[PDB]
C-alpha cells in the first residue's frame, strides 16, 4: 500500500486544513500516487490479475470522484488535473 | 439502494402488523408525516410522533382490533419506475369505497374522496384497505 | 526499519570461526546503519536428524534491525559460504531482546 | 526480440528477424580486427574436403579473449557488438589500465557493468574464476578443457554448462549435449549463460538467406547416378538400400567415435 508519510505529505499538500483527509482532491491524489507506484509492479508482474482488480477499482473511483468535482466546481478540476498531469 | 422510502414505510407497517408489533419506527420525512396524518385521521393508526432534530425518527403506534390487524391490505401504486397520475374523474375506489387511496394533490396530500370533493386529482401514492 | 531474525547453522569443525563470522556480520549491519538487538551463540547442538551426513551443528541466533539490502547480501554470504549449512531469516514485527529459552 | 515479417513478398512471408536494439550501430574496434579469408571448404590440396561451403558475405575476424588472463584488474563493459563469425554477441570491455578487449557476452550483461577475472573475483555473471573456486551447481560458460588453453566449451549463443560435482583435481560437468565429462579443477570458467538465446528462433525465409551465410545447396543422394552416390540410380524413385554416406558408411545409428585417449574423461555419454 502507500506509506504513512507519503499520505500525510499529500494531505498537507492538498488539504485546506491539513486534517481534512477526505476531500475530493485528497482522495484523488492518493489514488494517483498508488496507481503510479503500481505501474512498476504490473510492468514486472503482469500476471497479478488479482492486484489489477484493486488497481482498476482505484481508477474507477478516481474517475467518479473527478466527475463529481467537475460538475461541482470546474476550476478546482482544472487546477487539479493540471497539477497531477491527468489527461482527463 | 434505498430508492423508495414510501414503500419502505408501507412495508414496515405491513410487517409490523404481521408481527403484531405495537409500534413501528422509521426515518421521518415531510411526506411520511403527511401520510401518517392521513392514516391517523382515517383511523388506521392510533398516533404518530416524530422525535429528534438533525435526523428525525417517525414512530407509528399501530392499531389492532379484536386481536387482529386493522390494516388488512396496503399497496404501493406509484413507484419510481412507474409514476401514476390520475384525473379527478378517474380516481379509484379502493374496496368499493371502504378502503382509501392516498393522493398527492396540488393542495396537499389527501384521500381520494376529499380529492373528488375538492375537484382535483393528482398522484396516487398507495391503496390502503 | 524491518526487524529480522537470523539463525544460522555452522559446520561444527568451523566452530572456531564463529566469532569471526559474527563480527563481520555485525560490522556489515552497523556499517549499513543497522542496529543489533540480540545475539546468542548456542554452541554445538545435536541435530534432530542428520544434515549433510553429519550429526551436530553450531547454532547462532540474531535479532536485527537493518535495511533489507544488507540482509540480502548476508543471505548471499550464507549461500556461498560452505561453513554455514542452514540459514533461516524470519521477519519479525518488532525488535525482540529477551534471551531465548534455549540459551538458558 | 523476434519480429515476424509481413508478407509483402514470398521470401518475407516466413522470415523471423531477431532484433536486438542494444547492439552498437557503428564500426567495430579496429585493433581487434583481422582478415578472415574464405576457403570454399578446400584444403591445401585445393580439393573440397567438406561440402556445401562457399560464397557468403565478407567477414572480418574479431579477436576474442577466451583465455581471460587479465587477473585482478576490473573491467567495465563499454558496448555490445555483433560478431558475424559466431552466434553469440560480443562485449567490448575497458580495463582500468586502458586495455580494451572483446569477450563473449553473457545473458544479463549490459553496457556499464563491471567484470573481473581471477581467483579473488566475485561470483556474478561475467566473472571468470577456476572451478575449484566456483560453487557446485552453477551454470558457467567459456569453459577451458586444459588450464590456460582457453575456453572451448559452451561458446554458442544460449549455452551453459552445469557443474555437478568435484573430486579433488577434477570437476564433473553436465554439458549441453547431456554428456558428463571430467575436467581439471584448475580450468577457468565464466559465469552465466551466453547471450543470444533466441538465435535459434530465427527463420531465414528464403534460400538467399543461407547463401548469405555461405551455405551452398545440398543435393540429396538418391537424385543422382550410382557412380556418384550409393543411393543413386533407379528408374523412378527407387531407394532399396540402407542409408549411407557418399562414401558408403551407415548414417542412421552407426557410431563413429574412436578415441581411446579421452575415454577416461567421459563419465557417461549422451543419451
Amino acid at each position: 500500500s502507500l506509506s504513512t508519510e507519503a499520505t500525510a505529505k499529500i494531505v498537507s499538500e492538498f488539504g485546506r486544513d491539513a486534517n481534512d483527509t477526505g476531500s475530493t482532491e485528497v482522495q484523488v491524489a492518493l489514488l494517483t500516487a498508488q496507481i503510479n507506484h503500481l505501474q512498476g509492479h504490473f510492468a514486472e508482474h503482469k500476471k497479478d490479475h488479482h492486484s489489477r482488480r484493486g488497481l482498476l477499482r482505484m481508477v474507477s473511483q478516481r474517475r467518479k470522484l473527478l466527475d463529481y468535482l467537475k460538475r461541482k466546481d470546474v476550476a478546482r478540476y482544472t487546477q487539479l488535473i493540471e497539477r497531477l498531469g491527468l489527461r482527463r | 439502494s434505498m430508492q423508495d422510502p414510501i414503500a419502505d414505510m408501507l412495508t414496515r407497517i405491513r410487517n409490523g402488523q404481521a408481527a403484531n408489533k405495537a409500534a413501528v419506527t422509521m426515518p421521518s420525512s415531510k411526506l411520511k408525516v403527511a401520510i401518517a396524518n392521513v392514516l391517523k385521521e382515517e383511523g388506521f393508526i392510533e398516533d404518530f410522533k416524530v422525535e429528534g432534530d438533525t435526523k428525525p425518527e417517525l414512530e407509528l403506534t399501530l392499531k389492532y382490533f379484536q386481536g387482529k390487524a386493522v390494516v388488512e391490505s396496503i399497496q404501493r401504486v406509484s413507484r419510481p419506475g412507474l409514476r401514476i397520475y390520475k384525473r379527478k374523474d378517474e380516481l379509484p375506489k379502493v374496496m368499493a369505497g371502504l378502503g382509501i387511496a392516498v393522493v398527492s394533490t396540488s393542495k396537499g396530500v389527501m384521500t381520494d374522496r376529499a380529492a373528488r370533493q375538492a375537484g382535483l386529482g393528482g398522484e396516487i401514492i398507495c391503496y390502503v384497505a | 526499519m524491518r526487524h529480522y531474525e537470523i539463525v544460522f547453522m555452522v559446520h561444527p569443525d568451523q566452530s572456531e570461526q564463529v566469532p569471526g563470522m559474527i563480527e563481520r556480520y555485525t560490522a556489515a549491519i552497523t556499517g549499513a546503519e543497522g542496529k543489533i538487538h540480540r545475539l546468542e551463540d548456542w554452541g554445538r547442538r545435536q541435530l534432530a536428524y542428520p544434515i549433510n551426513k553429519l550429526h551436530k551443528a553450531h547454532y547462532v541466533l540474531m535479532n536485527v534491525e537493518a535495511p533489507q539490502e544488507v540482509i540480502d547480501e548476508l543471505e548471499t554470504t550464507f549461500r556461498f559460504n560452505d561453513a554455514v549449512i542452514r540459514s533461516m531469516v524470519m521477519r519479525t514485527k518488532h525488535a525482540v531482546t529477551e534471551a531465548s529459552p534455549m540459551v538458558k | 526480440a523476434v519480429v515476424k515479417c509481413k508478407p509483402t513478398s514470398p521470401g518475407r512471408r516466413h522470415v523471423v528477424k531477431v532484433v536486438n536494439p542494444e547492439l552498437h550501430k557503428g564500426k567495430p574496434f579496429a585493433p581487434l580486427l583481422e582478415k578472415n579469408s574464405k576457403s570454399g571448404g578446400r584444403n591445401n590440396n585445393g580439393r573440397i574436403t567438406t561440402r556445401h561451403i562457399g560464397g557468403g558475405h565478407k567477414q572480418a575476424y574479431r579477436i576474442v579473449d577466451f583465455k581471460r588472463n587479465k587477473d585482478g584488474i576490473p573491467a567495465v563493459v563499454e558496448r555490445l557488438e555483433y560478431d558475424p563469425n559466431r552466434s553469440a554477441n560480443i562485449a567490448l570491455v575497458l580495463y582500468k589500465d586502458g586495455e580494451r578487449r572483446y569477450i563473449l557476452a553473457p545473458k544479463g550483461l549490459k553496457a556499464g557493468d563491471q567484470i573481473q577475472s581471477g581467483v579473488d573475483a566475485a561470483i556474478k555473471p561475467g566473472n571468470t574464476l577456476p572451478m575449484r573456486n566456483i560453487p557446485v551447481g552453477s551454470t558457467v560458460h567459456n569453459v577451458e578443457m586444459k588450464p590456460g588453453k582457453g575456453g572451448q566449451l559452451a561458446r554458442s549463443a544460449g549455452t551453459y554448462v552445469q557443474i555437478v560435482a568435484r573430486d579433488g583435481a577434477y570437476v564433473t560437468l553436465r554439458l549441453r549435449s547431456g554428456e558428463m565429462r571430467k575436467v581439471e579443477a584448475d580450468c577457468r570458467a565464466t559465469l552465466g549463460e551466453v547471450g543470444n538465446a533466441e538465435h535459434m528462433l530465427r527463420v531465414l525465409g528464403k534460400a538467399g538467406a543461407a547463401r548469405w551465410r555461405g551455405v551452398r545447396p545440398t543435393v540429396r543422394g538418391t537424385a543422382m547416378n550410382p557412380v556418384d552416390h550409393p543411393h543413386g540410380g533407379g528408374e523412378g524413385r527407387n531407394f532399396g538400400k540402407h542409408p549411407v554416406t557418399p562414401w558408403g558408411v551407415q548414417t542412421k545409428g552407426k557410431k563413429t567415435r574412436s578415441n581411446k585417449r579421452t575415454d577416461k574423461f567421459i563419465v557417461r555419454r549422451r543419451s
Partner: protein, 66 residues
C-alpha cells in the same frame, strides 16, 4: 482448555521445544486440536512453528529417518 489462552502469549516461539514436544507425538506428527483442546489460532501458530523447527533440525520430521 487451552494453555496458550491461559498463559496468554501473543505468538508461539518455535524455539520452545519442550512445549512443542508436549504437542507432537512420538512419530513427529502434529497432535490434533481435538485432543489438546487448543484454540485454532494457536493451533495454526503451533504448526507454523513446528514446521520451522523441523527445518532447523530441532524437531524430527519423523522418528525413522536416522
Amino acid at each position: 482448555f487451552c494453555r496458550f489462552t491461559a498463559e496468554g502469549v501473543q505468538e508461539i516461539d518455535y524455539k520452545d521445544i519442550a512445549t512443542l514436544k508436549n504437542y507432537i507425538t512420538e512419530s513427529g506428527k502434529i497432535v490434533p486440536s481435538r485432543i489438546t483442546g487448543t484454540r485454532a489460532k494457536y493451533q495454526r501458530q503451533l504448526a507454523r512453528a513446528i514446521k520451522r523447527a523441523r527445518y532447523l533440525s530441532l524437531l524430527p520430521y519423523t522418528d525413522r529417518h536416522q
